[PDB]
Design a protein around this ligand. Sequence first.
Ligand SMILES: Nc1ncnc2c1ncn2[C@@H]1O[C@H](COP(=O)(O)OP(=O)(O)O)[C@@H](O)[C@H]1O
Ligand SMILES: Nc1ncnc2c1ncn2[C@@H]1O[C@H](COP(=O)(O)OP(=O)(O)O)[C@@H](O)[C@H]1O
Ligand SMILES: Nc1ncnc2c1ncn2[C@@H]1O[C@H](COP(=O)(O)OP(=O)(O)O)[C@@H](O)[C@H]1O
Ligand SMILES: [Mg+2]
Ligand SMILES: [Mg+2]
Ligand SMILES: [Mg+2]
Lengths: 517, 517, 517
Amino acid sequence: IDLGRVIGELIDHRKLIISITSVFTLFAILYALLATPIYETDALIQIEQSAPETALLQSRMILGKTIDDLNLQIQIEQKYFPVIGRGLARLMGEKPGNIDITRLYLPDSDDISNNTPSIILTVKDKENYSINSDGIQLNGVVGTLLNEKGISLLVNEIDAKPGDQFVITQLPRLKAISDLLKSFSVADLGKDTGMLTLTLTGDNPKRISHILDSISQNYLAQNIAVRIIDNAVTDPNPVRPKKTIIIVIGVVLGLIVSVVLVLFQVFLRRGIESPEQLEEIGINVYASIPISEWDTLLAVGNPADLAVEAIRGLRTSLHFAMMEAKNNVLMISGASPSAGMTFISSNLAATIAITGKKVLFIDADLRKGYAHKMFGHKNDKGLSEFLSGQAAAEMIIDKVEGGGFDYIGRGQIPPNPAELLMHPRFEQLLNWASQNYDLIIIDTPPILAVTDAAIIGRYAGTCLLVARFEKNTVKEIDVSMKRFEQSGVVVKGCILNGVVKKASSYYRYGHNHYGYS
Amino acid sequence: IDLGRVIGELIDHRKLIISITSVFTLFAILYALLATPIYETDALIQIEQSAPETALLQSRMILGKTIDDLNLQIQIEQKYFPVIGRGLARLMGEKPGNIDITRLYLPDSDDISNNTPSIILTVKDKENYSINSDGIQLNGVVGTLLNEKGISLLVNEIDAKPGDQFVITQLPRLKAISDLLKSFSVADLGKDTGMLTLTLTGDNPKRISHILDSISQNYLAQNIAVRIIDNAVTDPNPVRPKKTIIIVIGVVLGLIVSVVLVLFQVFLRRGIESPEQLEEIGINVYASIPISEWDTLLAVGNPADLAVEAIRGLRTSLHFAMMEAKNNVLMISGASPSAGMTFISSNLAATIAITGKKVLFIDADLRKGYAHKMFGHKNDKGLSEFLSGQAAAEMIIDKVEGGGFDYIGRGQIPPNPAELLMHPRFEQLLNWASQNYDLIIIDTPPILAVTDAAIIGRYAGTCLLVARFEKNTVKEIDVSMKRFEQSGVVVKGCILNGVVKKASSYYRYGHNHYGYS
Amino acid sequence: IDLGRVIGELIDHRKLIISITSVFTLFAILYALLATPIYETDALIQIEQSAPETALLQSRMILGKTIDDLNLQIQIEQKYFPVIGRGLARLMGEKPGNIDITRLYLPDSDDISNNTPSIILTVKDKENYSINSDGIQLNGVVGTLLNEKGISLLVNEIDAKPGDQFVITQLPRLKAISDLLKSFSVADLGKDTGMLTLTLTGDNPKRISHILDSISQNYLAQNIAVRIIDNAVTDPNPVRPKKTIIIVIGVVLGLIVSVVLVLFQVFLRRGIESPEQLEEIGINVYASIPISEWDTLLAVGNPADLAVEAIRGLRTSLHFAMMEAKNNVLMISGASPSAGMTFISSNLAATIAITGKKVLFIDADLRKGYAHKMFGHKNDKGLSEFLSGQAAAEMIIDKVEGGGFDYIGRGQIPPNPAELLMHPRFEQLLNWASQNYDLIIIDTPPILAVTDAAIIGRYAGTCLLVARFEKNTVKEIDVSMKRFEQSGVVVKGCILNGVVKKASSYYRYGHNHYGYS
Ligand SMILES: Nc1ncnc2c1ncn2[C@@H]1O[C@H](COP(=O)(O)OP(=O)(O)O)[C@@H](O)[C@H]1O
Ligand SMILES: Nc1ncnc2c1ncn2[C@@H]1O[C@H](COP(=O)(O)OP(=O)(O)O)[C@@H](O)[C@H]1O
Ligand SMILES: Nc1ncnc2c1ncn2[C@@H]1O[C@H](COP(=O)(O)OP(=O)(O)O)[C@@H](O)[C@H]1O
Ligand SMILES: [Mg+2]
Ligand SMILES: [Mg+2]
Ligand SMILES: [Mg+2]
């Protein structure tokens, strides 16, 4: 590997890299724009030590005095059904509603798990409201207290629009103190001075300042039975979330994920990349057919296609490689199915037929052949019917419409194709056709699947394999050629099919293909 | 080894990896859901030092004062017979019962080992209960004290359902103090301040808070003859077990166990993996027969099987490898038993017989041959009977029903098979059959077990070995071929049998097999 | 790589390096000359400790006392519409205007985001002024206070020219204190002494000194209910921006950017650099044609060109390489389009024609040939018309005007050029022309694009490829030559075209070209 290789691999997978990075950045931006802002307030306390004073400030005594003073055991949250409703409501510019409660006494279910009883309050107007705990609907009025169904509730100054819902929870005193202690910190700022820097974070900028003022005043009143230099004020800029660092982390995470995925794909790739890989082993590659992006013959629908140009190059190579051959029969086979054998055989027959030569195309794939469908057919009396003795050599030959060559179809699918192909009638047909045609092209099944290609290849002067660009492997093609040669069939060379242009291929070998029109 | 190799090995053993990891995670989840939760309580003590105060708090004086005050030498546990009954009862939502005892005096057996006398109390109703120490049944009533059989017991406020059992133990005072000291810790929290952070853990959230309050009050009363800032309250969230870390440890442990097992299997694997291993040594592999998942011939029951397709490929290879041979006799042997010699020989005979050729199948395994069973037989007058002189060459030949070839069975098992096979009658039979049949296939025992294959191979023009996919070894096959060649028998090649597709094999060599139907 | 290579690469890309470095230095100089200068003032405070005194100086108490004393919650900035207007106005020598405000009360919109109400004040003369907040125009007079539209404003001593605009912002008290605290620092200077070094930075040298004096006096008056040794004076030399370090950083950044870009281009370069690269593979390079910077023939317009001299060298090489050839037909082809095939063929024909020989130039590029345009033409009856049977060999040959050789044009573009070139009429034409001309030069399309060159090359005794200097690749040329040789065409050698002189090429190989006139 080198700089050219890595740059080419990054250019090839650019769509994957961009998509993954964009998804990660979109998630990061959504989180940074929908997360609830958290504000911070601070105060300054002067001590005439401070090491016992920190633990006395963070003690349940002071914190619970604050909880009782400010009624922090009553928890009120506006109801947004999804996990993004609050964020989108804040983004839409809707101000958050709030209600003032000074008295709340729930029936204290106190079951095994739900230690915090909760109700839902729905606002009907500026004055009245509705309450439902477990489906039990009640109606209340601001001002007058409610004592019904074992529930005591006092709501004042509803500041919201009608239809809003609020979840009212009565959490235990220790839970409230634990929350306050989790959001409250004390420092010394000099490690020796009497200055104490109290800090408190929360999602309500006014409430956190009120809470910190209450804490400071309670501590002062306790200690005088300590000077407050700065009363608590809230920094208007939220301390969390940190949007820029969140987005940067998202970008970097997306980039590293994309890079590792690309590396895994590159290292797990095993297919053929260029004809040079085949020619290292000693396999002559006679053509490289590109992918045609255009049941019709390509060489007839679009004679000016790049794939048909590559097939004409293959025809020119064959006109020289097929001389000094024992006969005029050419067999095209391959390693794996759907490698391009029928495509290449049919289009090669078309391109050789337009040059004024008589061509016969035999579809000796007695299992899954569709040449009759691709050419327009009379399905009766095919190769199977001829081989099984129930047809003559003259009634099986047809004419391609937009072609210019004859063809023989597979007929009906037999139960014994490999035993049919061993009959001497096949060699009789080939010997008869070699005297009436200038070229016979035989299409065969793969060799790594069945043995029909190796049975047929005995009567074929020239045999070529078709290798798929990314699917097949060099070892696979070597295995196919050695299995052919083990049965007495000499494979002339190979044909790489379905080639596409890649930047890594350019930085390793080169272009090796152009357009000229 | 490389990335492709390791990924293939992980993919192959994925069932083992998943099973082991799932078992480990299931055990971890069961432990984390059935373990008893352990709560924690804490208090704050202010000292006007604290280094002698820690050791005075953790002293037997204070701890035993607490034990005597709270009657902690009476141990009560609800009876759950299994080691998971308590956990499953807690999961099922059953509240744990408890009883209040203020007086307990067991007869104090005080034997060599059982220093803690214990009894079992069974609840009958809200008022009465039953007591049995060593089978001695007694009945008691809440309120009135019991003084019978040297046992004094006072039970108040039974809060449980009838049928519950409780193990009541009177552990010694030092044992109670040791337990309390094990569950009790003191810290300074400033290393210089007068603040002390007392901590106590246990499985009863109310009891641990009561115990810590008693400890604090006893220490205060002792010291005044120290300020208590925070009385003990229990954190409702248990501190143990830590479910998430337990589950993560379980997952990681399962993964590492699976990986090490996979590595051991990979490094201890010795069998053949591909025909390339055999061809490195110079052994021509003529076929690779896959495992057929479908006493019948495969080539007759399922002629369209993948194994029968591979056997047809072998037939095509043999039609070319068996030319220029001294005669038309083919001997199939192998290295080890149950390698596939009879399977391959019989199916090869069937596939060569369907092509209109006359085939004779001789079962020259005079020890454990079952070809007659597989073909349908007249067990009389087999090869043994012919060789021992008590039969003619015409009465030993039979007909396969769904075959199309003749066969000769082994007859009765002789006591001297290797000495029977050395008789000139065997060569006479082969010479006679070579004039009446187009092909003779001889099935033989292994060569690493007996010498019959090497005796027979003298009269066979072509000899092929059958190697099992994972069982046999390259060295084993080389030993077999050299033992054959040492006795004057030239082995043409090999046949790999029982091949299966593996991801490691793909990432090392390739597919090398396909389906086409 | 070595010193010669790196020096040559730096010399080649000197224009890029200089341009990038100059752009970076220009940006750095513009920033350092347009950034607003920031001045610094300092004072000395003596303490009779100082560790609590630092935090008491930097406290909201003292800072807010200063804010209230100096009315620092009224923010006034002169209006410059661009982000460089202030800098360019300072550079132009314009003194910055200022206004004195002692009373400002905006209606306090206090919306969701814009917590700082702001207005714009436009100066009409030394006395009057205009005010517009959101389009509401008001007129005021220095002296008399304004109480209109809920806005209270008092402006004194307007010192500016008419037409100036000022943005007047009433930022909140905490924001003002935060700004002052951000620009204010305290140190001890001895870590033990009572000396305190107060510092304050800002863009107004007089205002920052006044602010620091107010801070010092407020702290003194608070502490006496501390000695001021040095009252605050402003250092006239701004502390920021640091112009020299900014410019040096710009220079170094430009240099490193240029170097990394040059390294990337060098490592991603893949084209041919010298004939030695081709001759390593075994390809005889017969010429190297330089770029001609001078629809006309070069060999006729400028016969004394360096490119025409290189073509005469090629002619001298050909007069020796074309002996012992089967005929007098020369085919010039190449790997990729726009490599120089038509240029080289036409100019070579001209240079061989001026030596008194009869030359025929055939334009066998039946797809995109423009030789008729380059020579002056009668477009009728070209090579296509001859090959398609509708013309004679005598009506297709024309005369080049400023040439001295005949030529055959492509005629009309046919739909089947490759099938036309396979007609025996082409060989008949070549055989006829080889008896009437001393040399035939055939121009062909590329070979990596189409197969026409490989069809034609059968009848050509000598074939040469044209390689482009930087565009084509050694692997590309090897692929072209092997594709030619695979179709039975023997390529004699290569011709490097479009060569330019480079310092890296000199320090690797040498000059290899000179001028002599
Ligand atoms: N270079 C190619 N460009 C476009 N289509 C192709 C190409 N090669 C094969 N195909 C098409 O993809 C399908 C599979 O190829 P096919 O030749 O039919 O399989 P097989 O070789 O096993 O007989 C076919 O529909 C074929 O037309
Ligand atoms: N590729 C295979 N697929 C399915 N079954 C097989 C295969 N090879 C062997 N067997 C079966 O496994 C058993 C053992 O093989 P066998 O040929 O009888 O042993 P041996 O070679 O020693 O005579 C047999 O029942 C056989 O049918
Ligand atoms: N060494 C060169 N100096 C100046 N111009 C050149 C040189 N080589 C090619 N060209 C000009 O650049 C253009 C492309 O070259 P051309 O020979 O026409 O392409 P092709 O080889 O594919 O037929 C032409 O206009 C040509 O005149
Ligand atoms: Mg096909
Ligand atoms: Mg057997
Ligand atoms: Mg051209």
